[PDB]
Symmetry: D2
Subunit: 437 residues, 4 copies
């Protein structure tokens, strides 16, 4: 077979740290690490049937004289420019290894936040000396040219303002802002730029990191990745997207409506091009019809104005600075943010647990947000997660019930995603993994 | 007034160096060059727009401070001058000072060398990786997207970019390369922009240019290009790009340059095939079939253009050592004084151009170069535009076979919108072919 | 109190890592004492502490990480009212290492991996660095001729682009580094590393000079010993007292093990002309007790600084290739065999010093291991607070064994007393913490 | 010949810049060769140092990465284990850089502007840097106690983040930089600057130590002197011979200009305890010749290295405010008034020494400027090759004047002789190059 060697950015490892990543009987670790490493070599589509395409891929970790070398059997050939692996992709492979190893060397509420902290610290993601300048960007993996161009323009304007970018991984509004920021930073001579990509193992093949990401972090699960986003964020920019972006929006809004979070200054701007006005009218209406009028104080909307969204982020930075100091908190990690256990407790989407969601309009707005967060994660899981497609493939779409006022508003929004092509990367038509009862 | 202080890269200057820049001809050139870099975003009626602008060089405790009176407001993001634009201001000041503190063939080349070395543009220990990118300032979106794609592909191969200044193909590649370099983790990227005082207002440097150099004239800029180049990529363009093409092919056809390995790739999107078929034909119709060994054409393949440059870099390395030459400056390349002698285009000197097909191909190249620079001057240079206001178009004559071909090519530039950036009135020719 | 604030290399810390270091806490007292030792960079007792009873240190987790509030710090840590920047760095190194050890008390394999873990966490193990680390060993209490000699050897190491790993304190612990500061400056070696390894029970007796740019605090004497020999690419030993003899018997015992026969690392004993009779007596000590087979592991180089350094320098490619052959790291010698008689933590007290097997019918490695322990007791009785307390209320440590081994040891200990190697010379004469039966 | 190649910090050069230092332009090569030889020779203080290395030559080669130098039979003490000390390598390119600049750029304003231009080309004038440069003057030939003192002051300057500008050579020219290497390392001052200024006629007598990281070759003595005082933010003067007296008389003659009365730069004369009588005598010589008015411009500090360094350090904010007040550079003191008598190059032969006006009925600034030239001639007659050649065939330089002055100068020179300051002790005994009438 074809064998490539990869040389190292990264620490020495012990035999203890590394023996767990041998192909072995009655452990799942190697295949987790292999799949994550495979995904990184594949920056095509959004299904996890790419594991069927590269079934003869394998990876070996070697402890040698200058640290770790990796040997790749049959890697995807589009990792390669002129027979050599793009240096960014090389670095992602070591980020994979670093984070898988950390987490497995380190197997309630304080415990979870502390683990999220530890992972991020081990990754080098929390820079002690840094002034607040980190903007989390959220938006669709499946987006048209006009929306993509708009994300690039916003990225550009953040770049000019010496701001850094944290996103998820994948195509669309996950790579657009970094590409624009590449230009904006170079205009502004900002050499210390950071493009942070946060992923987890069940999502990573579906949405592989761009090699422009210069700090990849693999979180253990979706909820810990979401906690990482909101604890590192200094501002939040939200683009148009499908159910993944909705999940992320409802996560932060459930958090922000807590009374303890009322002096948390973190700006959220929903932003899009002129043609996303109808998307944003519909989305704003959904939020206020479900979570109440109270939610609207936590965000603002900017249509057709990249510089404004980025100006808002930029202007808010001294606010974030002052507030961290008032709380005796760190700049780089928001300890003082109150996240309730209903946002922290891992949700494994199957038919049973999708049914058992209390999606009724007589809850606390926070707990309802926590529930719809879970709802939208199940939609994601049924679409893109290899385990989650299997449960649809044997037992049909996930069954979902509640207040019919909410249920019909949810179904309209979900169908909007289908109609605007937000569910899937386009190339046959989408069939729901969901069923609203 | 609106008064901005800019602090500094920039060396200390003496009183002797500074005194000459006090607000006769030297202040104006310096002011106008500095106005140009503040106005990033193709005529020189941009002087009228900011008539109340002034600049003061102050010698202070840590070096040079600059005071701007009424600078253009699009240099500013949120009340602060873009840092790249600040660096351009000091690059302007560096180069005006150097040229004025110093000022045949060996004299001219050593001046060109000295300017570049003073600018820090000649990095002694660097391996060959510099691609010169030529192309139109006035190009469509498909052509523009193509330039940024090639730039991307050059970034991924760890190659650097030298270009002229301005919009269009002058900014595209750099912007693609920003992404490509970032993916490739290439932190030591170099985006060289070369300009001269007579064109800088019409074609201002993008703030993404991180090495701006100002040459004293067009001919010394063209020499700077070809002595620094390790390869050349040429996109579709107008008369300025044609000038540069004919400059290089003229040079490359000299027998003493037969061992010069420098690759030249003419490249463009699918839709540019007719452009290149027509341009390639013009080239072999004028210079001969002997011209074709000095370039190739790569249509609709950005990776191929960049692979050709990348593959050539060890060959450039070996050739420079074979000649006992520098990596960063090609001293060994032969430039005859017909390519070096500064051409001042006016009504008189345009009509006195010798443009006949009964000529040595290198002399015809050097003469066609002057013709196309003439067109450029009448379109973009303030003194050129003023001369067409006063006297009408530059007249050109010669072999009527050559005259028909030139006219067709010029007419192609007009019809493909290559003469003039959109949004004014229609282009009217600054040339008339007799 | 005189509050001096020390501003923040040093990572963000959680509250959980930090809370045990409040004044109530045996951990705080340890942290305080290490921090004060570091602030007190001209005697070798730990009634050093009793000069500074009103000293305390508060850790504050703030916006850019840890700040330190010092209450009444030693005033020779200051130059014109500002704390020396090297001492500031040492304060954070202390914090880092005490935190790391305390967060990791969860068995030969456990010892080595902890030592690996501490060093890697400290930044002491550089991936990608080729072998250039010389461990320098010698007495803390030496004369000017001996001192200038270590400084000359230091200069010769520096010219050859070699780095220095040593213990902390005065005398031969600072000499080499001061010499190498000149040597490295001539050679333009800006990436110089001067490593100082210590542990909490000895740090107050032998405080790190500010010139040490990589201070590491190991949890005990034995783990410092392992760190020395796992990191060393060469070893230079100057004349010294019981501490230097302990270290010498540590390494000779390791290197005589038959599994360690291929290990290429040089050991050079070296001193000025006047130290010939010191080495004549110590070479005789070693060969009478351990064997003629001990002698093949070290050489002796009197009065040639450039030759000691040259032996180190010429050994580097040999050490380089050997590590490659073993698929071993350059920076950490995993393959070296350290048997558990060199790892087992020895708490010197009256009972344990009595139980030592010093009989000349042993395996020569195990005799080396017991002589190691014997010499650590002498050190502990002299300069360590808890060993001083044992000596105060029970009298001197009592050792027995083969009567002409014991007469050779009594002679060698008496040489140390005569040469003022036991203790930096105070008003009263040295009284032995040891009696040989 | 043994050919050693030196690879290229330093620019590309043209054929035109290089052609002139081909061996045949004929004068220029021999000057360039001698400067490069001196640099490789970092033993004694004659200029029969060129007679030992008659087969040495140097060839400049324009190559692919800039300049390569081919050394034919270089001195072996430029080498450590068969490789040239990188400090010395950098020194060869400094020589080349400066020889080229001066000879490509061939009254009062033009001399200052060339001094400036040389310094700026060398990289010696740093934009953005605040005042921290201490000029150190002192003997080339000094005992161990005076040497150790200079190292201690150097250390104390180092601890205060001050940089050092000095002459080249042994003695008080190397002492401070070696102490500072340690003091800068304690304070983590990695951006340390050790400037050594020299000129072609003195370089072989007094070669740079490889510890000097910024070597500048000036075209003559007077231009070196101007470079010192224009860059200085403070001045320390140790005991020394005629060359240090020369520099003392330079600075004191400058500082007694009424236009210089506001210049805040401190001058501290400093020495070990045993040099008290030396300073007693020199203080008397200065106040007798120049007046009580000379004494307000310096102080004497005996046996306190820290106080000498403290005076320098505390004066920096005063120097800073003053350069702001005169709208002058931090790095280069344009505003300092230097009269042409201090600028005008003196060439010591027998006629110019005899034509010196040396009469105690003078303007103190005129008398200082003349005594400057007198001492320069003693230095030239001692160490300069063309100076020694004048006395080898016409006998000692003759000086005459006010017989009170002439006996004071006689006594001071005889003190230099008695204290071994004229010549490094261990050749033949010193025979005076001067006769006082």
């Amino acid at each position: 077979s074809l064998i490539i060697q990869v040389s190292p950015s990264m620490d020495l490892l012990s035999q203890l740290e590394v023996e767990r990543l041998k192909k072995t009987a009655s452990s799942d670790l190697y295949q987790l690490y292999r799949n994550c490493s495979l995904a990184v070599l594949n920056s095509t589509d959004n299904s996890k049937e790419l594991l069927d395409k590269y079934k003869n891929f394998d990876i070996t970790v070697m402890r040698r004289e200058r640290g770790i070398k990796l040997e790749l059997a049959n890697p995807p050939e589009h990792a390669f420019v002129d027979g050599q692996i793009i240096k960014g992709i090389q670095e992602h492979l070591f980020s994979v290894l670093r984070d898988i190893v950390y987490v497995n060397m380190h197997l309630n509420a304080t415990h979870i936040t502390n683990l999220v902290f530890g992972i991020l610290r081990n990754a080098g993601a929390l820079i002690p000396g840094a002034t607040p300048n980190l903007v989390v960007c959220w938006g669709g993996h499946s987006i048209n040219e006009v929306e993509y161009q708009y994300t690039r323009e916003v990225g550009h304007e953040l770049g000019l303002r010496e701001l850094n970018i944290c996103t998820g991984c994948g195509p669309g509004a996950m790579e657009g802002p970094m590409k624009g920021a590449a230009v904006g930073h170079a205009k502004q001579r900002y050499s210390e730029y950071r493009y942070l990509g946060l992923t987890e193992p069940s999502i990573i093949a579906a949405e592989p990191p761009n090699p422009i990401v210069n700090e990849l972090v693999i979180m253990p699960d979706i909820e810990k990745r979401l906690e990482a986003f909101v604890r590192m964020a200094h501002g939040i920019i939200i683009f148009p997207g499908g159910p993944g972006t909705a999940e992320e929006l409802l996560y932060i809004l459930g958090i922000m409506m807590h009374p303890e979070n009322a002096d948390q200054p973190m700006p959220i701007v929903l932003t899009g091009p002129k043609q996303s006005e109808a998307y944003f009218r519909s989305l704003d209406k959904f939020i206020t019809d479900t979570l109440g009028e109270a939610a609207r104080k936590h965000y603002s909307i900017a249509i057709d104005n990249p510089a404004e969204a980025a100006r808002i982020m930029s202007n808010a930075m001294p606010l974030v600075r002052q507030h961290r100091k008032d709380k005796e908190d760190a700049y780089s990690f928001n300890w003082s943010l109150k996240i309730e256990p209903e946002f922290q407790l891992p949700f494994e989407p199957n038919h049973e647990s999708m049914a058992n969601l209390d999606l009724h309009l007589n809850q606390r707005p926070e707990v309802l947000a926590a529930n719809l967060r879970r709802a939208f994660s199940g939609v994601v899981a049924g679409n893109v997660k290899a385990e989650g497609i299997r449960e649809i493939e044997r037992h049909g779409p996930f069954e979902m019930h509640g207040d019919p006022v909410l249920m019909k508003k949810m179904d309209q929004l979900l169908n909007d995603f289908v109609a605007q092509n937000r569910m899937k990367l386009p190339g046959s038509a989408y069939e729901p993994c969901y069923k609203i009862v």
